[PDB]
Amino acid sequence: NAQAEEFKKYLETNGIKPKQFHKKELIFNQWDPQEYCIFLYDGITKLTSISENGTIMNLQYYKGAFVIMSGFIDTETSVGYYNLEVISEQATAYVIKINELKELLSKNLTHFFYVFQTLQKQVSYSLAKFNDFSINGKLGSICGQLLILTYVYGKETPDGIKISAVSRIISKLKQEKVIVYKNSCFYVQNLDYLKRYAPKLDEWFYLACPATWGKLN
Amino acid sequence: NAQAEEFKKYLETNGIKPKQFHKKELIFNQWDPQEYCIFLYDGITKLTSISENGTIMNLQYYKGAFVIMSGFIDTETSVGYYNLEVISEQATAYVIKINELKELLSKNLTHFFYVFQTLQKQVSYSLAKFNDFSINGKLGSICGQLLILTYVYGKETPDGIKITLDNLTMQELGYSSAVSRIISKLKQEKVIVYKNSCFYVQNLDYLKRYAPKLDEWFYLACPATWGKLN
Ligand code: NA
Ligand code: NA
């Protein structure tokens, strides 16, 4: 991704250098008095919120390259009591304190636009997911997630694409033949069934991630 | 507002004039290939999507002042096939083609930040509401929505916290079918009283308990407003 690679250049050029993070560690946490702009260059992460009681809530996932900002750009205060936990074996991320980000984003606006549109993708992503649930119920949510897994972590094979109410819906899917489980691995082969019940999400991939969407279309 | 009125005057310095819209009109629509940046200055609107069926889904409500963009700021292409519909009797909005707004954003940094953190408020808002739904279902969502309106429009009075909201927008939210059941339940439990054609919140703590992460969101995003009713 050129825009992401170009952002990395500008960070490296200004003195910011990548940091390595192991699985399960937090690139930022909900108890830190200081807020950070994270440029996740490689690896997989999840956003979480931990209650007084201690329950973990998984709110969303991010794969690099992407930008996740734990503080408002102006006031520099938290946007929410959230943690950014590495779930891939390792992750590469640039950790910028938010008061410094406002300095380098001032000089150049092209870079600023790249961070700006990552927020836009997040906003439209949530709207697309909400739209699908509110029509096809839990069927839309699960096919939405499967289509997400199929677009990002998919690998085509000649047979297949390789990777409670919920349990019943999954059972229907295998029965309907949309997804096939063979030889210790899971394979999708009716991509357009997922698209019918997660239509807005498919639209979002097309308009937001056309290179990713185009690989299997 | 403070940071919004200076954005208004920034746009005016540059020559963009306010346009007025009326209820049921679309400020932008999902079939226009030209994408826009909307500075909703006054009024209430809602983001809609039309499905294959033709069924209408309401996705988000926005009040002025706020910024709604139909396209990505750099690529200039659509972020989603959406319509922005006016529901208040009248709405005032500055409509900028995505082409022009980028040159303006470049000139100023402080007004960039303003548009930037309205997106941030929306990102965190969606996660907060997701959280509250995963815990309390549509009761959490409706209490969460009533809590925002309470903070934003709530004037404390002897008869409770009155939600000063014209009924044209109040009857759009379903306060005048799953919403009716929830509203009637809060009435039965005396969380709200409906008098003189307006909602009076009697038990704010009840709303906060069922929408805790939206309460947190609002506190972190507008602490001064959050402070009056708390
Ligand atoms: Na933090
Ligand atoms: Na449009």
Curated annotation (Swiss-Prot), chain A:
InterPro entries membership: cNMP-bd_dom_sf (IPR018490), HTH_CRP (IPR012318), RmlC-like_jellyroll (IPR014710), Tscrpt_reg_HTH_Crp-type_CS (IPR018335), WH-like_DNA-bd_sf (IPR036388), WH_DNA-bd_sf (IPR036390)
Sequence ranges assigned to domain HTH crp-type in this UniProt record: 136-192
Matching PROSITE patterns: HTH_CRP_1, HTH_CRP_2
Q: Which SUPFAM superfamilies match?
A: cAMP-binding domain-like (SSF51206), Winged helix' DNA-binding domain (SSF46785)
GO cellular-component term (any): cytosol
Gene3D superfamilies attached to this UniProt entry: Jelly Rolls, Single helix bin, Winged helix-like DNA-binding domain superfamily/Winged helix DNA-binding domain
The molecular function GO annotations come to: DNA binding; DNA-binding transcription factor activity
Organism superkingdom = Bacteria
Question: What are the entry keywords?
Answer: Activator, DNA-binding, Transcription, Transcription regulation, Virulence
The record's function comment reads: Positively regulates expression of listeriolysin, of 1-phosphadidylinositol phosphodiesterase (PI-PLC) and other virulence factors.
Q: Which protein are we looking at?
A: Listeriolysin regulatory protein
Organism per entry:
Listeria monocytogenes serovar 1/2a (strain ATCC BAA-679 / EGD-e)
